[PDB]
Design a protein around this ligand. Structure first.
Ligand SMILES: [Mg+2]
Ligand SMILES: [Mg+2]
Ligand SMILES: [Mg+2]
Lengths: 34, 106, 95, 354, 44, 55, 120, 122
RNA sequence: ACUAACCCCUAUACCUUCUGCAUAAUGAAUUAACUAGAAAUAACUUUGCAAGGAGAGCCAAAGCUAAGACCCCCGAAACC
RNA sequence: CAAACCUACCGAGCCUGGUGAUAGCUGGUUGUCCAAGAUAGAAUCUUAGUUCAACUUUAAAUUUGCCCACAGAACCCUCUAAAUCCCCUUGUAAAUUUAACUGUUAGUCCAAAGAGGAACAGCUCUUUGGACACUAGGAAAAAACCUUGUAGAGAGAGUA
RNA sequence: CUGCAUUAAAAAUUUCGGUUGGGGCGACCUCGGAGCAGAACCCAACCUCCGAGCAGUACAUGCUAAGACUUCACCAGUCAAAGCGAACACUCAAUUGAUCCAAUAACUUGACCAACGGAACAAGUUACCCUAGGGAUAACAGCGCAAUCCUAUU
């Protein structure tokens, strides 16, 4: 609990980068589908 | 001030521990544990085993002595059907008192 | 402690330990309890009882007293009707 | 970290929203009544009875007794309710009750108990004494027929045996008197065994008396399968219990296999076990009543051992385990001078090589 | 113990408690029984 | 830290010479107690003789 | 010589006995029960039994207490039990009926003080 | 404060989706384990160092066989982040005394009892 | 290392003091010579003898005798 | 009366002797090779030291030692915390006792939980773990971050 | 003149306990309870405080003796079956002080030694100062931090 963004540990930083959300991607952009 | 150190009070022998007569089971500032079967208590509420055997911890019904007015007042105000429970420690004797053996042939 | 005296060139003995401790030939040392004659009125009978026995010393204190005492006091004595005669030897001692 | 309980909480049923509305114990006795009614109830946690209380097998105890007698409850209740109505009617009886001066005849009420609750109390008491666990290897029996035995001593005095009382071997030197109710056409078997009298095999036991095929109450004409032998409890061996067993025979039974020579002064021959004896007989055997008493050593036991058995009397002693001491250390710190005496074996002085 | 499932079995003060009337019931009511006979006054 | 009590010596009246110490109030008469005497193996009267100190 | 169940100094009643006498006083009947420490009951004398009912006026009076007291005294005498223990509450110990019940033990030959265990 | 980890029991339940993905048979569990340390014991708590010591995993990339029993499994779960666990396959069965010197643990996880160092004629 | 001295690549002097010195903390221009771990109470190892050992004395309830093996240098302001 | 001067350093001259004065302080402490080897505390005119204890070393005797399945360790008080103690199996080879002493306990940084009149950081101080004062590789240079240890030669290879 | 006493005078020897940036003025040093330290034990400050340096009731508050616990050492402190002997291991968180020595026929007693593990008894000032050291420790300067402050935007 700090006011200077509390700089993150490298190991914790890699954990967040790996566990980032990935939206599902359609095969065809619905916008170009009949 | 307040630079006092710990009193080193707690459980000395855990459940299922083999003990001898006179071994201290636990020491406490208040009656956290209550003596059960073949367990004695001193003035300082220290718990020791009068017999030699296996230490056991169980939960039993608390029935205070009638001369204990403070506790007698407590259980009189309880709702009907309420039963107080407290943790009790007992030791289970292992060896028998003795044996009968031949000593003479007269 | 005088390791080498100026008149004989030999180790001396601290007389302080002689007046306070008793050594058994087995190597054990026997002492009293501090304050066993001080303020007896403010002590419980159980405390006073355990204050007036003769107790042994541990390994470090025994080594401490041996170094401060010459070999004269470590000999075997044969005093007549000595009260501590039976305690000079250990019986049934394993390791 | 928390773990949900494996069962209902002791005080979960009580509502706490209307705790002041709920009535209180208001007395010590009412809480105590609830205390030990709830104490005997089973629980899913560790209890005192789990470690200390004796454990019984899940199988129900097998009963080998006679079928219970059948009575008319309504008629019995009507007679009982009218009996006390007239009893309460008398002013003299009521005067004694209010004055706390009334008395009851102890002899008369005991006789009534022997017919009403006698068999049940005797069975309950016999279970406590361990008769059912040692012999029969675990069973239950109700002594429906009462049995009275009194030992003849002197010229007028008697030594009755009801249950678990104390009778000296001197008073049991001679054959006792057996009195019990029966009718014609009934065959009876009498057996006496010493539960704790065995000197060699702890599991086995010693037979002391055996009467078979008793015509009614006439015990004189019964067949003497084994001669009567007075008990011989060894001095210092504790206190022994001797049980009188009464059997009812539906048909005549041959006892040649279990017959013993007269006199039977051999301990090996006198050895007998009720188990495998009732087992081989239960097809035509059923018990009728039991009675037992406790026996100690006296001067007469010396006569029995030396003359009747032609042997030396054994003397036993109760020996306690030696006291426990911790392992002796080279440097016992802060221990009294008497510490070395605990591990000393002899108090005499020693001099080694000198 | 807290971790064990039998935690809190010794809790006892939760069964023990730690005028304006309502809209259906009355707040406080007092009755007065005067009499020249003390025995009758207390008996009632 | 006013000293309100005093330590006094109790001497047996049996003549054995046995003594023991007990605390007493300053504003009080001399105490004649009944105490066990190890010499005579029985309880006998003890009377106060001297004042030891003030506590 | 049998060891007694020592302890339980913080609860009532204590358990340092071999045989205990328990007397139960209900609304209609009074039950006198004698049992061992381990739980097994040896002998009982309750007013419910028809044997003593024919001779007693009521089952909830001092006369009833004397009736079962002598009955229990004769039952204990013929069962071989001579020594026992009684641990009543202060009010029941002060009840007049109980004291006369103790008198039944004295005249019956029953002693309510168990002998001390010989440790050595 | 940094202390030991109590791994939830829910992690070790083989759902049917994992069964055909890894090829394991719940009805016929594998008899033995292959354990291989692939991470340094340094910069790790001391209690994990002792567990690695007990299982004989000192030198990295050195296969070791262990019994698939709850006691061994309990120890393995502590250091599951430092080792690789594979089942043991015996296509030729348990080796006999005659071929005890002819065994060879191939990299795919089976112990073939016939090692000839000769090209397959097929 | 190289055919090749250099050119290529790699590499933050020594001692001491501190958690941590390439440290811009001390010491050293260089050479030669001189310059700093002294003791056997107990214990350990190895012989001799053995309920005795020791070349008066001393120790001994397997001990006694003998041997081996552990304890530094320079520097004050002062006092008489 | 400037605390001046008394043979070119007088708050008490100089020389010799006691004297190899003492110094818990500074500096120093000489041939080769191998092995074991680090951070609980208490007392102290004591925190620049010393003693006990802990840790560490050597030799000897003995048998259990670490890990840990259930069961078990409080109530008034639900930060209902992470977790500890105890502990059969199993994996393993250590552990306890006896004898003999030296040396260290003026530490640093990181991750986490905290404390310092109800201070987001910073400063100081506790607790758990790791690293450093022991090798190498990688983050630009890098004591404390990541990878990795048991030791040599090779102009081999697979990886972190 | 000598010896022994009492007053002065002039002198002799020795010392300046620690903690609180410094000084002034003050505060603290020993013991116990809660908070940190949430669940075996333990765990620190400049820590937040609150208290303690007694009293009461006994007069078997007698004598022996297994087995145990501990304020992280020692010293010290605590519980206790059983037996003897009596009746029919007191309350209270702390409520305290070692050795030597003194008194005492003896049993016993003697401390605000509170700097509370206590030296039998010793204060100030030095800018006239000296020695051995310390950036483990101040001022000068450097570096960390921006508590605050300034500016610039919403
Ligand atoms: Mg504290
Ligand atoms: Mg010098
Ligand atoms: Mg090494």
């Amino acid at each position: 609990v700090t006011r200077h963004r509390r700089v993150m540990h490298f190991q914790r930083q890699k954990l967040m980068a790996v566990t980032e959300y990935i939206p599902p991607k359609p095969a065809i952009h619905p916008s170009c589908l009949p | 001030g307040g630079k006092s150190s710990g009193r080193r009070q707690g459980i000395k022998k855990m459940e299922g521990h083999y003990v001898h007569a006179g071994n201290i089971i636990a020491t406490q500032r208040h009656f956290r544990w209550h003596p059960g079967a073949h367990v004695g208590v001193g003035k300082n509420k220290c718990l020791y085993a009068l017999e030699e055997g296996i230490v056991r911890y169980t939960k039993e019904v608390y029935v205070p002595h009638p001369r204990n007015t403070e506790a007698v007042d407590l259980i009189t105000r309880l709702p009907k059907g309420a039963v107080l429970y407290k943790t009790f420690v007992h030791v289970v004797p292992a060896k028998p008192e003795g044996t009968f053996k031949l000593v003479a042939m007269l | 402690l005088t390791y080498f005296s100026a008149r004989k060139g030999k180790r001396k003995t601290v007389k302080a330990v002689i007046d306070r401790f008793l050594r058994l030939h087995c190597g054990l040392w026997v002492r009293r309890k501090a304050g066993y004659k001080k303020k007896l009125w403010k002590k419980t009978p159980a405390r006073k009882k355990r204050l007036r026995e003769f107790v042994f010393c541990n390994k470090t204190q025994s080594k401490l007293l041996d170094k401060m005492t010459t070999s004269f006091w470590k000999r075997r004595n044969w005093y007549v009707d000595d009260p501590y005669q039976k305690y000079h030897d250990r019986t049934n001692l394993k390791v | 970290r928390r773990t949900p309980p494996l069962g209902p909480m002791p005080n979960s049923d009580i509502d706490l929203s209307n705790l002041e509305r709920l009535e209180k114990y208001r007395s010590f006795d009412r809480y105590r009544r609830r205390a030990e009614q709830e104490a005997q109830a089973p629980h899913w946690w560790r209890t005192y009875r789990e470690y200390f209380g004796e454990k019984t097998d899940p199988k129900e105890k097998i009963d080998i007794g006679l079928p219970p007698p059948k009575v008319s409850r309504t008629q019995q209740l009507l007679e009982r309710k009218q009996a006390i109505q007239e009893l309460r009617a008398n002013v003299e009886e009521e005067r004694a009750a209010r004055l706390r001066t009334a008395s009851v005849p102890l002899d008369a009420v005991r006789a009534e108990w022997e017919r009403t609750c006698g068999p049940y109390h005797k069975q309950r008491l016999a279970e406590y004494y361990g008769l059912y666990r040692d012999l029969f290897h675990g069973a239950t029996f109700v002594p429906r027929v009462p049995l009275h035995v009194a030992y003849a001593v002197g010229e007028d005095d008697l030594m009755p045996v009801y249950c678990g009382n104390e009778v000296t071997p001197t008073e049991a030197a001679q054959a006792p008197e057996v009195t019990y109710e029966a009718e014609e056409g009934s065959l009876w078997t009498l057996l006496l065994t010493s539960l704790d009298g065995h000197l060699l095999e702890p599991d086995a036991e010693y037979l002391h008396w055996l009467l078979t095929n008793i015509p009614g109450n006439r015990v004189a004409e019964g067949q003497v399968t084994c001669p009567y032998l007075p008990p011989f409890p060894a001095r210092g061996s504790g206190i022994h219990r001797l049980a009188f067993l009464l059997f009812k025979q539906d048909q005549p039974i041959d006892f040649s296999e279990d017959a013993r020579p007269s006199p039977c002064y051999q301990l090996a021959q006198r050895t007998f076990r009720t188990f495998d004896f009732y087992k081989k007989h239960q097809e035509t055997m059923t018990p009728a009543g039991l009675s037992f008493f406790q026996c100690r050593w006296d001067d007469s036991v010396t006569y029995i051992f030396h003359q009747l058995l032609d042997m030396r009397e054994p003397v036993f002693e109760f020996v306690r385990p030696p006291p426990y001491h911790p392992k002796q250390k080279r440097f016992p710190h802060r221990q009294p001078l008497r510490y070395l005496d605990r591990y000393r074996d002899s108090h005499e002085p020693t001099y080694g090589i000198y | 113990y807290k971790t064990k499932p039998t935690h809190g079995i010794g809790k006892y003060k939760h069964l023990i408690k730690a005028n304006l009337g309502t809209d259906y019931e009355y707040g406080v009511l007092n009755i007065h029984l005067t009499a020249y006979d003390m025995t009758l006054a207390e008996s009632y | 830290s006013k000293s309100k009590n005093i330590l006094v010596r109790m001497v047996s009246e049996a003549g054995t010479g046995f003594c023991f110490n007990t605390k007493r109030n300053r504003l009080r008469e001399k105490l004649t107690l009944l105490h066990y005497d190890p010499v005579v193996k029985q309880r006998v009267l003890f009377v106060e003789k001297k004042k030891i100190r003030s506590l | 010589v049998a060891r007694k169940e020592r302890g339980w100094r913080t609860v009532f009643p204590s358990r340092e006995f071999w045989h205990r006498l328990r007397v139960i006083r209900t609304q209609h009947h009074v039950e006198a029960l004698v049992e061992h420490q381990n739980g097994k009951v040896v002998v009982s004398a309750s007013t419910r039994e028809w044997a003593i009912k024919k001779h007693l006026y009521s089952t909830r009076n001092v006369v009833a207490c004397e009736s079962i007291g002598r009955v229990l005294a004769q039952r204990c005498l013929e069962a071989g039990i001579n020594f026992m223990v009684y641990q009543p509450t202060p009010w029941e110990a002060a009840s007049d009926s109980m004291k006369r019940l103790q008198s039944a033990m004295t005249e019956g030959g029953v002693v309510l003080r168990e002998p001390q265990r010989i440790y050595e | 404060k940094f202390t030991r980890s109590r791994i939830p029991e829910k992690v070790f339940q083989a759902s049917p989706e994992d069964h055909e993905k890894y090829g394991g048979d719940p009805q016929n569990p594998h008899k033995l384990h292959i354990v291989t340390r692939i991470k340094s014991t340094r910069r790790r708590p001391y209690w994990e160092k002792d567990i690695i010591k007990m299982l004989g995993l000192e030198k990295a990339h050195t296969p070791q066989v262990h019994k698939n029993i709850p006691s061994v499994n309990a120890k393995l779960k502590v250091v599951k982040h430092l080792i690789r666990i594979k089942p043991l396959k015996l296509p030729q069965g348990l080796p006999a005394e005659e071929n005890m010197s002819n065994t060879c643990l191939k990299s795919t996880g089976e112990l073939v009892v016939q090692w000839h160092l000769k090209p397959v004629e097929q």
